[PDB]
Ligand binder design. Structure first.
Ligand SMILES: CC(=O)N[C@@H]1[C@@H](O)[C@H](O[C@@H]2O[C@H](CO)[C@@H](O[C@@H]3O[C@H](CO)[C@@H](O)[C@H](O)[C@H]3NC(C)=O)[C@H](O)[C@H]2NC(C)=O)[C@@H](CO)O[C@H]1O
Ligand SMILES: [Cl-]
Ligand SMILES: [Cl-]
Ligand SMILES: [Cl-]
Ligand code: NA
Length: 129
């Protein structure tokens, strides 16, 4: 599923991401746009052999099991394929664990390089929330 901007903002708020660990909703929408273009089915392969999955491009080296990243962890205890669903619950619940692990949203490279320090509130302008 390819979400609309305000559609995704409303879904993320319903799942408790607005101000989760101090990150306003616009931060999460901005990250989703540049990680996946709002597409739940997005996958990308990393140079180390791991793969990134879903709307928030969660990495199989650490967070999920895809059966082909040999010496990896599965810290969210889920198959990576669960992160590609049109239902974002699994992706959100795992993102909550990631952002609490010490580095905040700097775990998302595109957030650090394209959202951090910008006016992220613009990503939710005009949405009924
Ligand atoms: C969205 C996504 O999958 N992002 C990936 C990043 O998570 C990943 O960065 C590495 O993440 C792990 C787990 O959060 C980091 O380990 C943690 O490091 C902190 C120190 O800052 C420590 O306090 C935690 O205890 C420790 N946790 C564990 C379980 O060991 C690790 O430091 C991160 N590494 C870097 C270089 O930032 C990166 C890199 O694999 O990939 C993203 O896609
Ligand atoms: Cl915001
Ligand atoms: Cl933080
Ligand atoms: Cl990036
Ligand atoms: Na893994």
């Amino acid at each position: 599923k390819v979400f609309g901007r305000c559609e995704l903002a409303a879904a993320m708020k319903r799942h408790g991401l607005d101000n989760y660990r101090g990150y306003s909703l616009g931060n999460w929408v901005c990250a989703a746009k540049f990680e996946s273009n709002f597409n739940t089915q997005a996958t990308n392969r990393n140079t180390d052999g791991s793969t990134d999955y879903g709307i928030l491009q969660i990495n199989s080296r650490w967070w999920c099991n895809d059966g082909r990243t040999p010496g990896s962890r599965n810290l969210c205890n889920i198959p990576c394929s669960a992160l590609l669903s049109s239902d974002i619950t699994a992706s959100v619940n795992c993102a909550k664990k990631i952002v609490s692990d010490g580095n905040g949203m700097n775990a998302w490279v595109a957030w650090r390089n394209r959202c951090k320090g910008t006016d992220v509130q613009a990503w939710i302008r005009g949405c009924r929330l």
